[PDB]
Write a protein that binds this ligand. Structure first.
Ligand SMILES: CC(C)(COP(=O)(O)OP(=O)(O)OC[C@H]1O[C@@H](n2cnc3c(N)ncnc32)[C@H](O)[C@@H]1OP(=O)(O)O)[C@@H](O)C(=O)NCCC(=O)NCCSC(=O)C[C@@](O)(CC(=O)O)C(=O)O
Ligand SMILES: CC(C)(COP(=O)(O)OP(=O)(O)OC[C@H]1O[C@@H](n2cnc3c(N)ncnc32)[C@H](O)[C@@H]1OP(=O)(O)O)[C@@H](O)C(=O)NCCC(=O)NCCSC(=O)C[C@@](O)(CC(=O)O)C(=O)O
Ligand SMILES: CC(C)(COP(=O)(O)OP(=O)(O)OC[C@H]1O[C@@H](n2cnc3c(N)ncnc32)[C@H](O)[C@@H]1OP(=O)(O)O)[C@@H](O)C(=O)NCCC(=O)NCCSC(=O)C[C@@](O)(CC(=O)O)C(=O)O
Lengths: 261, 264, 263, 261
């Protein structure tokens, strides 16, 4: 009778629930917060307090960015179609991972690879252009070296105050000085910031070996950060459409080009 | 060492043996007997070998519900998800999850509501007035763009087939009388495709001979009818996904000028 | 001409210099140390809530974060991850199990207990009447926790509410119901759905940011189920990552656990 | 400029149109479900035998029992009291890689070998040398003298009705080599459907090679499996409701908990 399931993160078979070896009462006695629970359940580690707080700040900063982005819009459409909360949320979450919400992960990987390989920022920039590859985590539809992004400033201020070192973030900022020298909209965007700061946390907070940090980036920890954070906003938009008593939506024919054979 | 009772029960398909079985029909007999997709649905959903005209009706329903353009909630969401770079299954399901009481999934409720009124003995006008006195939408009635001035050819095709092939259509007849009343008052309160398929399946299940009344009522109650639209329209949503990938449409973001922001 | 807008929105404005959550700029959200609980108060309830309320919301997300791999949603997420799928697919395969039976009884519990309380029915008459009809008490019952196997999640929440909330009439009523139901069936405890449900009603009704009608509306539109959905999303993502790190392979349910009864 | 563009269906007129054919003409021409799929997925009026082939694939893939990942997940949702769409979707979301992905995988692998100009014996050897299993080959029980009847049925139709089947021919030569090594290593139903579908696209007359390859690459065969198996998943949903099955919780005896200390 060899067990068909295997699990590492939570044991609810005893009288008191356990998260990664910490009884739930100790989680609260130690004031771990949501960020510390995430460290237990996603990484099976008791993270330092500043790392737990940084995780919570990432969830707060990614909670929403308005009703116009793909996933919020799809949730809103479901809500207006009279659907339940979970269906509507899911409809929006399913838009995430590539062009919407995927740049956190892509930036963490692309910057880590350049940094680890020893290529300097100017040569990384020149390489990616000669190769016609966009630098993930760089560029924004509206923000600029003159209209800075406040979410970037907030997270940047915090990690510099608490992290032992932020080498990948510093490298990414050297890239930004070069890219914005040319095009002022090629800033380090909020997705690139979270991505590189999260690598710096995993690599420098002391709870991970390099191999462990590399594995958690590879299996999608950062995808999870964006998904969990933005779920709060999408549920908010679901509730908002119901509070505003919004009826069924159908897209107007004027905004659609039909090109049949 | 002791025998553990099985935790799951299943009735529709057996893959354990020398050949696949659908509701007791071996797959070789399914094809020998020319059961087609409609007959396989009869086996897997209704546990019966249905008459040929019923199998053909099921296929007609899947064909007429296959798509209704990119503007409807589910197609719009599938398109947005494809344009966000997502895979076929994620994009399809993002659209399917819009299907419900307002878009696409009123077949269950329409069958139940019309059956109740019909079986209760109230006449069509009394049904319309009662729903109005309560605060209740007539499910299977109404459309955002189709109307008495813009008729739905899907409904016509289905009606035509049912009248030629079904042995009895009392609920469809009742529903058309209702539609006569609702469209006099408001021109887009037509019998929509959900309502037509809903009442036509009630007529089929009650009168085709393969079901007892108890069985027919149970299939309405557990939600079989909505599956017809879900399975049908899945072909269109997959089409939209493929279309958007071929067209290489980029990431969508809704325009701010179409949104009224009213924060506290 | 002025074409009217087709969408309305009230919770977040990203158009300006600085992101705004429900009228609070993101800089002030962090200066005021609102935390995740305060952001939820802003985005879901459109209010700046007191700190003890924000901390209670965070506690609810922490205590609902996971309850093992055996429950319906974690099971489905694990199986989807073992099928090689991506994080979002695997998470949502499990979230879609949340409803009346597993995880999503908070809406119904809050509505049913609020209705009983507001009507003046005493706990025993509430129990007998649901018993005399065929209606489950939402927020009562558990497959494995019981009077002999208590839920520490419930204990932690009750302790916090008792220390910080200004009033707890619905919780007190629900605990009276639990005494009655567990007298005859040891598994009919007040579960985490019912506890969070009734505690949230007590919070919304008495925190001072809502009229009774406004609080009742949030129950009616289904806000409280979101608390479990968002909370448990953290555990389901954890299960996905766990299965990927464990290199667990494709799952297929054993035939010996399935009774086939075809026509 | 219009924000949406679409090619497959026009519902703006009085009469609905599928890819240039009015719906009344779809029925007058007895296009069937296969012909509708040709219009909506490919914007082509496919030959009759191609349309019938498509319907046979949907029938053959409709279900394969309650134990596979997606059917199981749908069953769990149904036992949790959820609605049809939620329960169906929970199961569909398991599809694409280790479950339900072999039609696509086999189409691609065989097409790549064939287009390499490499002969079957060299393909088998290249794959052994690269450590790769051959997609669409192998079955747990059936054998060169105990055949899979789904393969027999579809193979017979294809060989009787397709004018040319070069990729199937190629795959049958691979199978003769692999069944010499192990009588178990048959072309399975996913391999058959995969290569036959490629043959249909490449040889039915309606597509250029570029178009055929594009439809494979963007997931047309994933679509065939999803649409086909959706019929069975809906069946399982209804079955669980009919059988009045209550909430499931997996037994602790079948679970190995390995938390940190
Ligand atoms: C973001 C954008 C599409 C913008 O493009 P743009 O449209 O302005 O410019 P393009 O027309 O593509 O090109 C202009 C010229 O600059 C060159 N150029 C552009 N980007 C370049 C680059 N990265 N590396 C090198 N060169 C570049 C290009 O090659 C051309 O050069 P050339 O013609 O040769 O002169 C683009 O940067 C991009 O893909 N970034 C990488 C992916 C990424 O990080 N995504 C996340 C962005 S944060 C986000 O998504 C969150 C959100 O925004 C969500 C919301 O609210 O919606 C929020 O706030 O939450
Ligand atoms: C479908 C729609 C939202 C349309 O409404 P409309 O928006 O135009 O009207 P509203 O502005 O909402 O209401 C104006 C006044 O009429 C009243 N009124 C409306 N419907 C009424 C009714 N049924 N019974 C009584 N009264 C009614 C209402 O109470 C209000 O009265 P009041 O406030 O008191 O002054 C609405 O009928 C509805 O929910 N139907 C029931 C659900 C149903 O059967 N859905 C399936 C149809 S689609 C489908 O399945 C697929 C599709 O065909 C879709 C596509 O192609 O688009 C495809 O193939 O994709
Ligand atoms: C939860 C369960 C299905 C368990 O039932 P059981 O299966 O053990 O009992 P059954 O065999 O169904 O019934 C035996 C006899 O008791 C009667 N009886 C049962 N419940 C009764 C009741 N509420 N009111 C009156 N009577 C009742 C029934 O009428 C029958 O009477 P009779 O046949 O006439 O002799 C059931 O209570 C139930 O639906 N509750 C309401 C929904 C609810 O609140 N769900 C949330 C709880 S989980 C959650 O949200 C998260 C979770 O904690 C999950 C985890 O950890 O697992 C986590 O964190 O993951």
């Amino acid at each position: 009778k060899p067990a068909s399931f295997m699990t590492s993160i939570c044991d609810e078979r005893g009288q008191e629930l356990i998260y990664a070896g910490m009884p739930i009462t100790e989680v609260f006695k130690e004031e771990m917060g949501i960020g510390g629970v995430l460290g237990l359940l996603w990484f099976q580690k008791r993270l330092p307090k500043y790392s737990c707080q940084f995780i919570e700040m990432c969830l707060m900063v990614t909670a929403d960015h308005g009703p116009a982005v793909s996933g919020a819009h799809n949730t809103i459409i479901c809500a207006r179609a009279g659907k339940d909360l979970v269906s509507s949320l899911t409809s929006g979450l399913l838009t995430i991972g590539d062009r919407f919400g995927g740049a956190l992960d892509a930036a963490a990987k692309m910057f880590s690879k350049a940094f680890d390989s020893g290529i300097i920022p100017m040569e990384f920039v020149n390489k990616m252009k000669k190769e016609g590859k966009l630098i993930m985590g760089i560029g924004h539809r509206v923000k600029s070296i003159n209209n800075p992004d406040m979410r970037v400033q907030i997270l940047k201020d915090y990690v510099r105050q608490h992290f032992p070192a932020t080498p990948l973030l510093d490298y990414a900022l050297e890239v930004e000085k070069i890219t914005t020298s040319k095009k002022p909209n090629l800033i380090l965007n909020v997705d690139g910031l979270i991505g590189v700061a999260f690598v710096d946390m995993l690599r420098n907070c002391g709870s991970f070996t390099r191999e462990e940090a590399d594995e958690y980036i590879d299996i999608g920890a950062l995808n999870g950060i964006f998904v969990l954070g933005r779920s709060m906003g999408f549920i908010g938009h679901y509730l908002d459409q119901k509070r505003l008593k919004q009826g069924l939506y159908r897209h107007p024919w004027d905004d659609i080009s039909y090109v049949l054979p």
